[PDB]
């Protein structure tokens, strides 16, 4: 009967995409926040962390670490990973590009200050030139409401999460992609995601 | 069966782990080498690279990009991804930890010659303190010949490939881990992997 338990810092970091996915799935979960280095040593010393790191999620009697391992398990368990191996391949290709873009945005605060300007420019170029056009093309190719299989999958969730982060970075970047704008609205208006986006959910704020 | 066709530089890089997995699965595949900037421009312009990047593999009607996407599909198609959602979860956790360590080694040649001694040292400390102990513990916990489900999976293949790279870095690192040494020998002796390690295969040499 035990709800999934997510162990991380009280912050977005590498746990946030899991919070979105669980919420979009309608899954009830607890969080246990790491507040001290003592908290983190105790997880380690208890053997909770296969590679000594968080995020870790306790779910269905496993102690899963590695964001991709957590997410793949959630996605399959809740029917958000496509109908078969070939839909899962499209999903994977899409969401690994999202992950590549997300990683650049995620690590930007820790970019060497003398590299920061150039890096920001390069990031926005890739959004405008590489990533946003790729996803708009997928959407234009089939004219369907969802990225894959005409049904909600983790790819729609991970993409719309990413679109919120790009909006924080620069709200003009999505301007010229109306199908992306339209997906953002539809997905944000799904009861589970609409509730997640409202004040009070486990959704975490940006880092200062 | 249209043979899968892998597009990459004639080099290990980001395609090497897919050549390992394909070869281990007994799958015959063709390669097409990118030799110049023009060669890559053509693939981009031709609409073959979803995110304008290689590796890309033509398989089963798809133009799959993103290493993880490419390998998840191959692993599922050739029954190297465990037999269920929970064995997949253990595989993903193991192989994501493998990718983290392997990413570090992969990028070691392209960092600044002063952030290099410290970076080499840190990699060695992670190998001896974090990664090899984790994998040794899995092998010792069941005593079985393979990481997961008592049967070859992509995890044994990804791990043993990484053991070859750790050996090129420092052949002393594996010395205190007798079960990883036994796995490397056993896996290297399977018919398909023995063939891959012998001359004249798609296996690629270190860069220089």
UniProtKB/Swiss-Prot annotation, chains A, B:
- Modified-residue entries (N6-succinyllysine), positions: 3
Subcellular localization, per the record? Cytoplasm
Recorded hits in CDD domains, A to Z, give: GST_C_Alpha (cd03208), GST_N_Alpha (cd03077)
> A single GO BP annotation from the record?
glutathione derivative biosynthetic process
Tissue and organ distribution: Liver.
InterPro entries membership:
Glutathione-S-Trfase_C-like (IPR010987), Glutathione-S-Trfase_C_sf (IPR036282), Glutathione_S-Trfase (IPR040079), Glutathione_S-Trfase_N (IPR004045), GST_alpha (IPR003080), GST_C (IPR004046), GST_superfamily (IPR050213), Thioredoxin-like_sf (IPR036249)
Q: GO CC terms for this protein?
A: cytosol; extracellular exosome
Activity regulation details: The isomerase activity is inhibited by S-methylglutathione (GSMe).
Q: How does activity depend on pH?
A: Optimum pH is 8.0 for the isomerization of androst-5-ene-3,17-dione.
PTM-bearing positions, type N-acetylalanine = 1
Q: What is its EC number?
A: 2.5.1.18, 1.11.1.-, 5.3.3.-
User: Locate the GST N-terminal domain: which residues?
Assistant: 2-82
Chief location bin: cytoplasm
Family of this protein: Belongs to the GST superfamily. Alpha family.
Q: Domains: what does the record tell us?
A: The C-terminal domain may form a component of the hydrophobic substrate-binding site, but in contrast appears not to be directly involved in GSH binding and is not absolutely essential for catalytic activity.
| Assembly with partners or alone | Homodimer or heterodimer of GSTA1 and GSTA2.
Function description: Glutathione S-transferase that catalyzes the nucleophilic attack of the sulfur atom of glutathione on the electrophilic groups of a wide range of exogenous and endogenous compounds. Involved in the formation of glutathione conjugates of both prostaglandin A2 (PGA2) and prostaglandin J2 (PGJ2). It also catalyzes the isomerization of D5-androstene-3,17-dione (AD) into D4-androstene-3,17-dione and may therefore play an important role in hormone biosynthesis.
Q: What is this protein called?
A: Glutathione S-transferase A1
Q: Which organism is it from?
A: Homo sapiens (Human)
Q: Tell me the gene name.
A: GSTA1
């Amino acid at each position: 009967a035990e709800k999934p338990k997510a162990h991380y810092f009280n912050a977005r970091g590498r746990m946030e995409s899991t919070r979105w996915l669980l919420a979009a799935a309608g899954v009830e979960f607890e969080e246990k926040f790491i507040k001290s280095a003592e908290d983190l040593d105790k997880l380690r010393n208890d053997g909770y962390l296969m590679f000594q790191q968080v995020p870790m999620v306790e779910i269905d009697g496993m102690k899963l670490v590695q964001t991709r391992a957590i997410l793949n398990y959630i996605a399959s368990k809740y029917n958000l990973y496509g109908k078969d191996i070939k839909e899962r391949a499209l999903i994977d290709m899409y969401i690994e590009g999202i992950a590549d873009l997300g990683e650049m945005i995620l690590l930007l605060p820790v970019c060497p200050p003398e590299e920061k300007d150039a890096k920001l420019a390069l990031i926005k170029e890739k959004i405008k030139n590489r990533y946003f056009p790729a996803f708009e093309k997928v959407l234009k190719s089939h004219g369907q409401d969802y990225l894959v299989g005409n049904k909600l999958s983790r790819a729609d969730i991970h993409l719309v999460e990413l679109l919120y982060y790009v909006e924080e970075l620069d709200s003009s970047l999505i301007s010229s992609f109306p199908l992306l704008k339209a997906l953002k609205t539809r997905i944000s208006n799904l009861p589970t995601v609409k509730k997640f986006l409202q004040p009070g959910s486990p959704r975490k704020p940006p880092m200062d």
